[PDB]
């Protein structure tokens, strides 16, 4: 469904958490296409930086046949 | 309440014309029903206690409902259930004479579910009682009158459940 494989670093700007938080601080995850705009916006609201993002799933420039 | 004849009269009157051909053949259907309905009412009013008697004997008697613990237990509750089934049979006979279930959903079903939930009356056991009345009426009045009586009794079942 033309998913993105992204990786990003999201720090905690307001709380000093005592549990382990690599898994939601620096993480690699698969995000779908229609969710990726909202997800990238949400990272940039939270203050994290998108380290890298590539199109692991699907083919760029496909006019049709993406569902 | 209303029957089928006043139903088509009111349906003509609400749009404000006289009796048209749909009213004509609806009245012809009701008059053709006619004799069968009045004969079924005559035989039900004849053996009125018989259907409720062996209906309770077929469905309710000798079970955990009429054993201690159940809701048919104690004589006051037994007489109340006999009264309820006489109510249901009388009002089903009235709806059978009418040709419409207006007396059913306008004299019986409103408030009945919530008052039975307040009294703890078993809805499924009342449904099986109504099915027993349906079977004994089908055995006593015939086939066509029996099945339209069954339509009115399981309308009571569908409203109550």
């Amino acid at each position: 469904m033309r998913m993105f494989r992204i990786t990003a670093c999201v720090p905690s700007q307001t709380r000093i958490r005592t549990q382990r938080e690599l898994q939601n601080t620096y993480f690699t995850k698969l995000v779908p296409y229609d969710n990726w705009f909202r997800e990238q916006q949400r990272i940039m609201k939270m203050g994290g930086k998108i380290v890298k993002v590539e199109l692991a799933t699907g083919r760029p420039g496909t006019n049709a046949g993406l569902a | 309440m209303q029957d089928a004849i006043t139903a088509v009269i009111n349906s003509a009157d609400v749009q404000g014309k006289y009796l048209d051909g749909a009213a004509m053949d609806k009245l012809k259907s009701y008059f053709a029903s006619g004799e069968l309905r009045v004969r079924a009412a005559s035989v039900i009013s004849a053996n009125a206690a018989t259907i409720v008697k062996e209906a309770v004997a077929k469905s309710l008697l000798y079970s955990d409902v009429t054993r201690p613990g159940g809701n048919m237990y104690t004589t006051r509750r037994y007489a109340a259930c006999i009264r309820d089934l006489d109510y249901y049979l009388r009002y089903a006979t009235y709806a059978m004479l009418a040709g419409d279930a207006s007396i059913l959903d306008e004299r019986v079903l409103n408030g009945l579910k919530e008052t039975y939930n307040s009294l703890g009356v078993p809805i499924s056991s009342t449904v099986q009682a109504i099915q027993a009345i349906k079977e004994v009426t089908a055995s006593l009045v015939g086939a066509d009158a029996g099945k339209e009586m069954g339509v009115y009794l399981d309308y009571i079942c569908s409203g109550l459940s």
């Binding site: - | 206690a49 409720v52 008697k53 309770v56 104690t74 004589t75 006051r76 037994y78 007489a79 109340a80 006999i82 009264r83």
Partner: protein, 160 residues
């Protein structure tokens, strides 16, 4: 229950319990040992009272057991003895409670309508509980026979 009856009367008159009702509750609460002894006597002799009174009832009224009768078969006779055990249990409950309100609430309101729906001769049910009273008074001590016969008397009067 006598406590329930006195509370109901005091609530109807919108007052606290009178000293007469209160020391009647005192007298019952001291003398309940004899009434529970009567209840244990009836519970121990449960089967023989019902059996002997059923035999005596079917001797006195053989047309409830004849063909065309209400209690014809052996299963129908078992239902007759089941009703006898019901009313013996209610008489035991009334003896324990000290008042006829449990008997009224369980097995005497609408009994005429129930036996009308069942076709059962309620005068013969009154005869049945009368013979149960006779057998219990036969195998019970005389003061205890009078104490149980008060509630048996009430059941006979409300059936008949």
């Amino acid at each position: 229950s006598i406590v329930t009856k006195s509370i109901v009367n005091a609530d109807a008159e919108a007052r606290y319990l009178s000293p007469g009702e209160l020391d009647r509750i005192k007298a019952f609460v001291t003398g309940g040992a004899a009434r529970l002894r009567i209840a244990e006597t009836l519970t121990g002799s449960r089967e023989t009272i019902v059996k002997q009174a059923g035999d005596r009832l079917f001797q006195k009224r053989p047309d409830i057991v004849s063909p065309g009768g209400n209690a014809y078969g052996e299963e129908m006779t078992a239902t007759c003895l089941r009703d006898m055990d019901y009313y013996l249990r209610l008489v035991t409950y009334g003896v324990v409670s000290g008042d006829v309100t449990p008997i009224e609430e369980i097995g005497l309101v609408g009994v005429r309508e129930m036996y009308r729906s069942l076709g059962t001769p309620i005068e013969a049910v009154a005869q049945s509980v009368r013979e149960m009273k006779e057998v219990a008074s036969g195998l019970m001590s005389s003061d205890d026979a009078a104490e149980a016969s008060a509630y048996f008397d009430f059941v006979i009067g409300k059936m008949s």
